[PDB]
Amino acid sequence: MEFVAKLFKFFKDLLGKFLGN
């Protein structure tokens, strides 16, 4: 379903937050 679209978008945010840039 469309849930998976949010998940990666959520991860991209978290991963970028935990690192630089």
Write out the residues near its own copies by the rule CB under 8 A. Answer: 1-5, 7, 11, 15, 18-21
Q: How far is the CB of 18 from its own copies (least distance, A)?
A: 5
Instruction: Kindly provide the residue ranges of all beta strands, DSSP E only, lying in the chain, ordered along the sequence.
Output: none
Q: How far is the CB of 20 from its own copies (least distance, A)?
A: 3
Q: For residue 20, how far is the Cα from the chain centroid?
A: 15
Q: How far apart, in whole angstroms, are the C-alpha atoms of residue 2 and residue 21?
A: 27
Q: How far is the CB of 8 from its own copies (least distance, A)?
A: 10
